[PDB]
Design a protein around this ligand. Structure first.
Ligand SMILES: [Zn+2]
Length: 334
């Protein structure tokens, strides 16, 4: 309780520094926004949202969207999340009727690499996305996404189980918004709902006025922040072995969404209960590791904790560490 509020207070001390690390990212991103818009295949390129951190802070995430009419999806080998694209200026990227991720992605690179070599002032360099490093500290991941305005694919029909939490009316309204395809067969694309993830986090209560007044302060955002921070701290400490580096804040974010579904009432996230809500988040994540199952929140048959993605040994390792931390009141938080 008191230890975790001290952690949150420390994290806030870093906020008047993102304000200068994110401001520098953004100006490099609008500079590419223009050059892409000058290429004939990336003319309807824009930004998705305003406008994410995997490290919470030197990793920054920006997604470039791109409207593509006449979309058509073919599910790669009933993997639920991976698709080929079929149907214009994008005809240069197709290999036999289907849209080639690797071709479209590889010209994305050339155009950006052509540009970071022309910003002579700031020392930006290049190193599922393209990673830039602005002036030796803060990097950014730039992801290209295709936008489709059609109904969501069949593998999402049982996902986004927010009915008992955010209501069926909101689930209806969210599923009319577009969805996105990100390049990972190497010509396959992966569903992305980053835009929905952000909206659910910022409009996160059963009560429409959750966190808009002093009588309704939940600790939902503070639990996700602690969870992401727990993982970051553990990865730093276990860097002599580096067998935690398959895990990412997106696993924590997904697990936190499942816990929101389990604890749908704002009274289960009362700020006074920070210690117990955080514990709820950690034990669920723990169960995900021990069962080797972490369902993508939108695609239930897509297991992020598969053996394909993360081997058994790494999950066993993180289990033993999180288990020890939870049974000892998180000494990793000092
Ligand atoms: Zn709230």
């Amino acid at each position: 309780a008191s230890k975790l509020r001290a952690v949150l207070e420390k994290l806030k001390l870093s906020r008047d520094d993102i304000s200068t690390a994110a401001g520098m990212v953004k100006g490099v991103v609008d500079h590419l926004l223009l050059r892409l818009k000058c290429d004939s295949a990336f003319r309807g390129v824009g930004l998705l949202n305003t406008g994410e951190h995997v490290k919470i802070p030197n990793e920054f995430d920006v997604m470039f969207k791109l409207e593509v009419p006449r979309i058509q999806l073919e599910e790669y080998s009933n993997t639920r999340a991976y698709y080929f694209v079929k149907f214009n200026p994008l005809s240069q990227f197709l290999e036999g009727e289907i849209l080639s991720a690797s071709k479209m992605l590889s010209k994305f690179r050339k155009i950006i690499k052509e540009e970071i070599n022309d910003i002579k002032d700031t020392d930006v360099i290049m190193k599922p996305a393209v990673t830039l490093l602005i002036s030796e500290k803060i990097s950014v991941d730039i992801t290209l996404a295709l936008e489709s305005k059609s109904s969501w694919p069949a593998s999402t029909q049982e996902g986004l189980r927010i009915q008992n939490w955010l209501s069926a009316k909101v689930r209806k309204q969210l599923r009319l918004k577009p969805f996105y395809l990100v390049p990972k067969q190497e010509e396959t694309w992966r569903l992305s709902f980053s835009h929905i993830e952000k909206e659910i986090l910022n409009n996160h209560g059963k009560s429409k006025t959750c966190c808009e007044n002093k009588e309704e302060k939940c600790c939902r955002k503070d639990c996700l922040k602690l969870m992401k921070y727990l993982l970051e701290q553990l990865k730093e400490r276990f860097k002599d072995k580096k067998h935690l580096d398959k895990f990412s804040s997106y696993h924590v974010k997904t697990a936190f969404f499942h816990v929101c579904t389990q604890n749908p009432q704002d009274s289960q996230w009362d700020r006074k209960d920070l210690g117990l809500c955080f514990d709820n988040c950690v034990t669920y994540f723990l169960q995900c590791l021990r069962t080797e199952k972490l369902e993508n929140y939108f695609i239930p048959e897509f297991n992020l904790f598969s053996s394909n993605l993360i081997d058994k040994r790494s999950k066993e390792f993180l289990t033993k560490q999180i288990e020890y931390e939870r049974n000892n009141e998180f000494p990793v938080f000092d």
